[PDB]
């Protein structure tokens, strides 16, 4: 009952007999005159136990007095009926068959072992061709398949020397006679001669399987099935229905088929049937067996009576509706209710309105217990009937029981962790659970008929669990990003916006007040409006260095609304928070500031008070929508008429025959877009400042008091696009094929649409409606995979003491900063110090958690970039340390050890899936003759650095691009420095003088032709793919020389300055000209969710970009073929590496320069595998983070990067070994990186050579399947293959992941239970 492992291994026939209690030998299930089981039937009582508790079938022994005994009349053992679901039987097959899992689930595990094709094995199995198992003569070797004619020829020729058999028995003999160790050693010997990649792979797979057999103790003959185990009868029950008819399981049918065919085979064998007859019977027996194991695998699935394929055991193991995903992970739970939800405005954040009837039903055992304790009931039945007729005393005791007893509210689909929460119950009369208005954002719950379920914690640990961890007053900040989730939504924000806003001459303007209380008095008295501009006395409390509050009193120019709201604000907040119109962002900042300054409880009370006041004054406001509130702009008709005139004249011009149809289509699209923008701007202007009727100074202008503009500006509901479609112009709609239709929908939703515009808009409506469901399904699948890959990552250590880290820099792609340094660095821990003189020389020490104060100091001191410890670089085995992760976003302080971070990261990533001076760096350039600097490097970048040191913009120049300002120059804004020809690219040189044409002659490497643009005689090289036989062995080089002719060398090295210029170049420069240094010589031409899924599971792109694997010069090695071979030889040693490039793929870097480690040679998307294997783990981590964050930012979703880093770290768990030392690892084994890390640790501790390695970037699915735990992989996906691999390898599980303990039924090694597991471990290790 207390076990540390679950061991998987093959089943020998002797063990199969060992499980069984008797042999079933008859196809009949039960009798039907009396519903009693048969003898040796599929539900026989003798083998599977008695039907009833402590009873016999005859009825002789019928009580507990004979606790355990076997009746001599019917043979049944007197035991409780539960033994009917734990005792197995066995069928003794006559002809041994082959296990289908070890035959068809690729790789075959038999053909890979015997080294035979799967087709030949199937041919022998199907009784089609003979196979020789052994032969003394050399003519017939082992595993030589012969036909029937060849078999008869050999049998009449030798007849006695060889042994050739047919069917599964022959394969069993072949497996039995084979020797594992001799084959493995001879393959070890033969692996060393030559290494072809495919051959090396097949030999290494074979040797791994053979060594798995040698180590696991299994025998090769055991995959040949001889005795079939039989499931207990209660797991395949034959249960009657209410109509007298029975509803049996398909397993009974499969077992009947198998037993009938086996019995008939035995009959024919004893009857001496002809050979064809017994062969057919054996073949059908094999088909019965494999259909039993899994129906639709070998051939046609055997259908039952309703023409549907039968459900086999494998189908009951694997699948969406299998055992794993429907009964072990998710279960049906008692003490659960479900109901529709309404709105409760009088509650708090920690209360939920539970109806009386559901509360009575849920707490029924508790009510029984308390009623019994009080003495109002004698027995449990009395309590049952008493609560069944619901006296008032029952209600009073129910009120007593539920007091301080939290319950869990749950709404599906639970995307992120806030989908389940603990609330204190309050008894309400009705039938709907009353929720709190603020928690509707976390639940994503609307009040349009949504439903949720209620669960009841039972034990004390569960109650404290819900009180300290799950209470709605604890999880205030979202775990994905450190921002509050309980924010006012669409009503409180409207009320507060109407409060804090100011009119011009509302009522009693210019008044003066002694405090907020007088303001509230005046408003409730009716002598002043909420929008009057008044002078008020305010006493605000500020926080000094320590924890007390000092006070200051002054006069402020506020409104009555701001003063009234000042009552709500707790003491400690500055007055600038309330002194402006409060939108949704303003209130969010209010709550964030209150949390950061005061704590938790004051924030909770402040939120409750804000919601109460918002509802009250939103009700009192009386804001209403009307048909006059969507004011049509008065200039829409003129703009639409002008646009129609423009499109008409463009159409007429096109019909005249001047411009093409496509350009006309684009032009009319642009014209209509401009008209739509103008209409939208005019309407927004006319709605924004409607309130021009103003007094007491003059006719003044102020922000409009329109209802629609209120709901749009305050951020309550809607945005600019919705109001544009409402009162302005609907715009341009897209066709179902994605193209934009020419004529746009001019009318808005107020003027009413005609038939055709409505018909057009239906296309977009339907497309969006379908895309919603499709992206929901895709996001669900992605979330499941992400949760699986990182399910086993738990924080174990407090600090690993590592010095690695990621270099956090503000992303400055484009012309703006997407996230500054602040959003990048909040929460993380400094890996190193901040060593820069700067202006103040800020110096934070290592191992410091950067608070808000620390980040504010960093911004004040203007630090460019900081190195911080990251999860991917942590040095803890089987988990990470607390310092590397950083700050717990949900709480606000350092993370407690034992918190599962992988699940949080996966949920955070997969939740928003349903919404989707100039400084030159790394430069090598040459000065031209005009000062327009030209760079001959590729990886050069020009950044726009401030006078403060901050970097604002960055650009990448093409090769040979020209620029006027060098490093150290302070250029003013708006100056165009990036000047370059966009379409073509130059072949610039570095040496001045004249030019001599050497190594090119018109006819074999250049084409004699004249330029069609200038008329000058130009010698253009033709590409080597179309050259003659004389152009197949030379590279034409424009060998630029001095004024006389000798090839001048590049200064710095001894390589002559030559330029092997490639083909397909329009070379315009001719002889007898002046060439400067650096000048040109010739011109040579160059979704969101799917993107996230592709990035995380790491596909090789359709058009990979080629990197440089070794530093050195580049040259071509193979000729007369369009697939160019590249010899990147090093500048110091020999070149053992080559590259192959196809024909059609363009080349960026020519064969004249030198590349370092990791240089782009061909443009295009970069495969992350190459980036990892060349640049490093940090580079691939940064690449993945940036690409995911770009997609998540384009749609406007804030996700912290540490979650992506955790996913990436889980993606890099495997390390293929390139060179072995003394460990038990041969070569090229994708073994766990932690295993080799600890192996190297111990090997260097005892002083040996050690083993090198190379990490590999697997996809999420592949990494999840390659996990060391076979149970988790089986519960995930591809259960058949994973189980077969585990069985053949003889693996074992140590139960270290959360999912494993969820499946088996123990505490998870995380949170509260973590310590217990550690204790258990510290008791298992120390004894």
């Amino acid at each position: 009952e207390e076990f540390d492992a679950i061991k998987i291994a093959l089943a020998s026939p002797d063990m199969i007999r060992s499980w069984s209690f008797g042999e079933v030998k008859k196809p009949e299930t039960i009798n039907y005159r009396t519903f009693k089981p048969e003898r040796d039937g599929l539900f026989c009582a003798r083998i599977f136990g008695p039907v009833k508790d402590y009873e016999c079938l005859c009825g002789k022994y019928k009580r507990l007095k004979h606790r355990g005994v076997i009746c001599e009349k019917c043979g049944v053992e007197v035991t409780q009926t539960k033994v009917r679901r734990e005792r197995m039987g066995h069928i003794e097959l006559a002809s041994p068959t082959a296990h289908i899992w070890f035959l068809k689930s690729l790789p075959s595990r038999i053909g890979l072992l015997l080294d035979m094709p799967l087709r030949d094995i199937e041919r022998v199995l199907y009784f089609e061709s003979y196979v020789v198992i052994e032969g003394g003569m050399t003519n017939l070797e082992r595993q030589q398949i012969l036909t029937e004619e060849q078999y008869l020829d050999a049998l009449e020729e030798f007849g006695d020397e060889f042994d050739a058999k047919m069917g599964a028995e022959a394969i069993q003999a072949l497996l039995k006679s084979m020797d594992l160790e001799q084959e493995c050693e001879q393959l070890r010997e033969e692996l060393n001669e030559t290494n072809s990649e495919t051959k090396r792979k097949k030999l290494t797979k074979r040797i791994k399987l053979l060594e798995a057999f040698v180590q696991s103790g299994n025998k090769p003959e055991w995959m040949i099935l001889t005795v079939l185990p039989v499931l207990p009868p209660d797991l395949r029950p034959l249960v009657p229905l209410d109509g007298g008819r029975f509803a049996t399981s398909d397993l009974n049918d499969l077992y009947r088929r198998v037993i009938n065919r086996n019995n008939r085979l035995k009959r024919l064998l004893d009857l001496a049937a002809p050979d064809i007859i017994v062969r057919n019977e054996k073949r059908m027996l094999q088909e019965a067996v494999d259909a039993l194991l899994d129906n639709g695998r070998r051939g046609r699935a055997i259908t039952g009576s309703n023409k549907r394929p039968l459900k086999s055991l494998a189908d009951m193991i694997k699948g969406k509706q299998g055992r794993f995903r429907q009964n072990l992970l998710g279960k049906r739970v008692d003490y659960s209710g479900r109901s529709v939800i309404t709105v409760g405005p009088y509650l708090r954040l920690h209360q939920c309105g539970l109806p009386k009837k559901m509360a009575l039903e849920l707490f029924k055992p508790f009510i029984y217990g308390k009623l019994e304790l009080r003495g109002l009931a004698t027995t449990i039945k009395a309590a049952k009937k008493m609560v069944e007729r619901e006296e008032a005393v029952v209600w009073d005791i129910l009120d007593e029981v539920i007091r301080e007893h939290p319950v869990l509210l749950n709404r599906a689909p639970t995307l992120h962790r806030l989908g389940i929460q603990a609330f204190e119950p309050v008894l309400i009369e009705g039938k709907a659970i009353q929720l709190h208005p603020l928690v509707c954002a976390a639940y994503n719950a609307d009040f349009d008929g949504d439903q949720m379920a209620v669960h009841v914690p039972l034990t004390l640990e569960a109650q404290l669990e819900a009180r300290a961890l799950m209470m709605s007053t604890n999880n205030i900040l979202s775990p994905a990003n450190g921002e509050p989730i309980i924010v006012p939504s669409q009503d409180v924000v409207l009320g507060l916006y109407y409060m804090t806003r100011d009119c011009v001459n509302a009522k009693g303007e210019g008044m003066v007040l002694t405090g907020p209380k007088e303001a509230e008095r005046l408003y409730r008295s009716g002598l002043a409006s909420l929008h009057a501009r008044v002078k008020v006395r305010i006493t605000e409390y500020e926080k000094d260095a320590n924890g007390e509050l000092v006070a200051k009193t002054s006069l402020k120019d506020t409104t009555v609304g701001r003063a009234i709201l000042w009552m709500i604000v707790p003491k400690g907040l500055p007055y600038s928070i309330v002194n402006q119109a409060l939108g949704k962002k303003a209130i969010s900042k209010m709550l964030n500031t209150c949390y950061r300054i005061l704590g938790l409880k004051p924030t909770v009370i402040f939120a409750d008070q804000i919601m109460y006041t918002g509802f009250a004054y939103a009700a009192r406001s009386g804001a209403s929508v009307g048909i006059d509130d969507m004011v049509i702009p008065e200039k829409k008709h003129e703009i639409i008429s002008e646009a129609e005139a423009e499109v008409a004249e463009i159409q007429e011009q096109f019909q005249s025959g001047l411009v093409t149809a496509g350009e006309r289509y684009n032009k009319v699209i642009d014209i209509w877009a401009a008209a739509n923008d103008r209409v939208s701007k005019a309407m927004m202007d006319n709605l924004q400042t409607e309130t021009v009727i103003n007094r007491d100074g003059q006719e003044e202008k102020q922000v409009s008091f329109n209802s629609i503009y209120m709901m749009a500006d305050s951020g309550a509901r809607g945005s600019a696009a919705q109001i544009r479609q409402l009162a302005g112009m609907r715009g341009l709609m897209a066709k179902p094929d994605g193209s934009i239709i020419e004529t746009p929908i001019t009318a808005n939703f107020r003027e009413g649409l005609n038939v055709l515009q409505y018909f057009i808009s239906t296309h977009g409506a339907r497309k969006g409606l379908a895309d919603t469901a499709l992206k929901t399904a895709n996001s669900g699948y992605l979330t499941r995979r992400l949760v699986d890959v990182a399910q086993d990552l738990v924080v174990t250590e407090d600090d690993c003491g590592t010095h690695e880290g990621i270099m956090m820099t503000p992303v400055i792609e484009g012309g703006d900063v997407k996230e500054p340094l602040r959003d990048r660095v909040l929460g993380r821990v400094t890996a190193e110090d901040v060593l820069k003189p700067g202006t103040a020389d800020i110096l934070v020490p290592r191992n410091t958690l950067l608070h808000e104060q620390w980040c504010d100091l960093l911004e004040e001191n203007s630090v460019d970039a900081v190195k911080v410890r990251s999860v991917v670089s942590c040095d803890t085995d089987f988990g990470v340390c607390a310092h590397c992760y950083g700050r717990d976003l949900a709480r606000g302080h350092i993370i407690n050890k034992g918190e599962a971070i992988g699940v949080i990261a996966a949920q955070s990533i997969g939740e928003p899936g349903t919404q989707l001076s100039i400084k030159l760096s790394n430069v090598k350039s040459v000065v031209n003759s005009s000062g327009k600097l030209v760079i001959t490097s590729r990886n050069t970048e020009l950044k726009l650095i401030d006078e403060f040191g901050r970097t604002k913009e960055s650009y990448k120049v093409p090769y040979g691009a020209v620029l006027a300002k060098g490093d150290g120059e302070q250029v003013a804004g708006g100056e165009t420095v990036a000047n370059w020809d966009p379409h073509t690219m130059p072949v610039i040189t570095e040496v001045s003088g004249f030019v001599r044409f050497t190594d090119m002659i018109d006819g074999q490497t250049i084409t004699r032709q004249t330029d069609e643009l200038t008329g000058l005689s130009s010698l253009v090289v033709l590409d080597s793919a179309e050259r003659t036989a004389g152009g197949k062995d030379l590279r034409p080089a424009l060998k630029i020389v001095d004024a006389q002719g000798n090839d001048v060398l590049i200064p710095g090295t001894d390589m002559p300055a030559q330029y092997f210029l490639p083909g397909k170049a329009i070379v315009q420069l001719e002889d007898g000209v002046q060439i400067s240094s650096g000048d040109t010589l010739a011109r040579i031409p160059q979704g969101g969710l799917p993107r996230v899924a592709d990035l995380f599971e790491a596909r090789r792109p359709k058009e990979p970009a080629i990197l440089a694997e070794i530093s050195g010069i580049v040259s071509f090695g193979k000729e007369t073929k369009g697939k160019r071979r590249l010899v990147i030889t090093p500048v110091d040693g020999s070149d053992p590496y080559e590259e192959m490039i196809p024909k059609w793929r363009q080349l960026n870097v020519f064969e004249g320069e030198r590349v370092e480690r990791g240089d782009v040679i061909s443009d295009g998307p970069e495969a992350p595998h190459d980036i990892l294997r060349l640049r490093g783990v940090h580079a691939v981590t940064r690449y993945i983070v940036n690409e995911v964050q770009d997609v998540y930012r384009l749609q406007g979703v804030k996700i912290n990067d540490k979650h992506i880093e955790v996913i990436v770290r889980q993606m890099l768990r495997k390390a293929t070994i390139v060179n072995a030392g003394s460990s038990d690892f041969l070569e090229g084994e994708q073994v766990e990186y932690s295993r080799v890390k600890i192996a190297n640790r111990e090997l260097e501790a005892n002083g040996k050579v050690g083993a090198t390695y190379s990490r590999d970037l697997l996809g999420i699915t592949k990494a999840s399947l390659a996990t060391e735990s076979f149970i988790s992989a089986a519960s995930f996906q591809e259960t058949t293959r994973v189980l077969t691999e585990a069985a053949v390898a003889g693996k074992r599980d140590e139960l270290r992941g959360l999912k494993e303990n969820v499946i088996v039924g123990r505490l998870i090694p995380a949170g509260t239970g973590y310590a217990y597991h550690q204790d258990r471990m510290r008791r298992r290790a120390a004894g």
Binding site: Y32, Y126, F127, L268, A273, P274, I276, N280, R283, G299
Partner: protein, 359 residues
Amino acid sequence: EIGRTTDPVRMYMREMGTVELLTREGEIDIAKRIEDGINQVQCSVAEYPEAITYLLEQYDRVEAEEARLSDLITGFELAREKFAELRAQYVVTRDTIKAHATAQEEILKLSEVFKQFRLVPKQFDYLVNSMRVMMDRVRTQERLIMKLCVEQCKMPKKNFITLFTGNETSDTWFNAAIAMNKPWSEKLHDVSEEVHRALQKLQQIEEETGLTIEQVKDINRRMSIGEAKARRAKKEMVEANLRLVISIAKKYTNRGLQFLDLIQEGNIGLMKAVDKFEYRRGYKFSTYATWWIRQAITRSIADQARTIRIPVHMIETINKLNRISRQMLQEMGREPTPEELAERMLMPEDKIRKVLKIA
């Protein structure tokens, strides 16, 4: 060809179609070969004396009327007198055991007077398997003799079998092999005791057979060759009539059993029909074999068709009901009621009996 296929029916028909049909007279000669093998094995086992002793004592014990005389003899007041005359021939043979060709003459005339005796196959098979069991007893005797022969001497088999095809009963052949003074001849003295236990053991066989080793060897050899010829003829008859089995079985499809199971049960029935077919009636084999094939197929469908097994008589009644219902539904234009079925069905059946008969 033997290539890409998975349907067992297709493959089975492929091997079945390589055998040609038989004519009106081919079946006649096949049956003649079958009966020739049967007669040959019957006369081979008839010549063995202890066989006639066993049949004589069986006839004597059934002359005590412990079983009906129709149980043993299936054809050819009359049985008693022929039992008496075969008893007289047996006792006159007992008077002339070795006194010497007249003993062989009387045992052979006993064999041919036993030729007309067509008997029940159970006792015939009992006799032949008794022959086989004592023949494999003696075969194990000479097999352990051969083991003793080539376990320590590494000696050629020819010289030993030449001295073992003569007497092989007393000890003088073993002593003759000893006395030949071969280097591996004098080394056989280590196993002198055990082979002696062998020599008497086969002697026991001798004294329970009354004949020499060669006589029983050739008798069982003739029995074996006759059995092999009969088995080959039976096989050729069976495997040339599979198309008839397929044609009969194709009409009972989709009633609970797969097609190939029906084919196999029809094949078993065809084997039975071949075992019981007589060509001297002048009829074609197809007419006699059809009854057996159909009976086997329908009995197979009556035991394994449904999850719950129903007895054959109940299944027959169920049909005796199905047909009636259909007949009445056709006649009246509407489905019958239980009372009408009671009226039309049977004299002992009433409403309750057939209501119970409905599942």
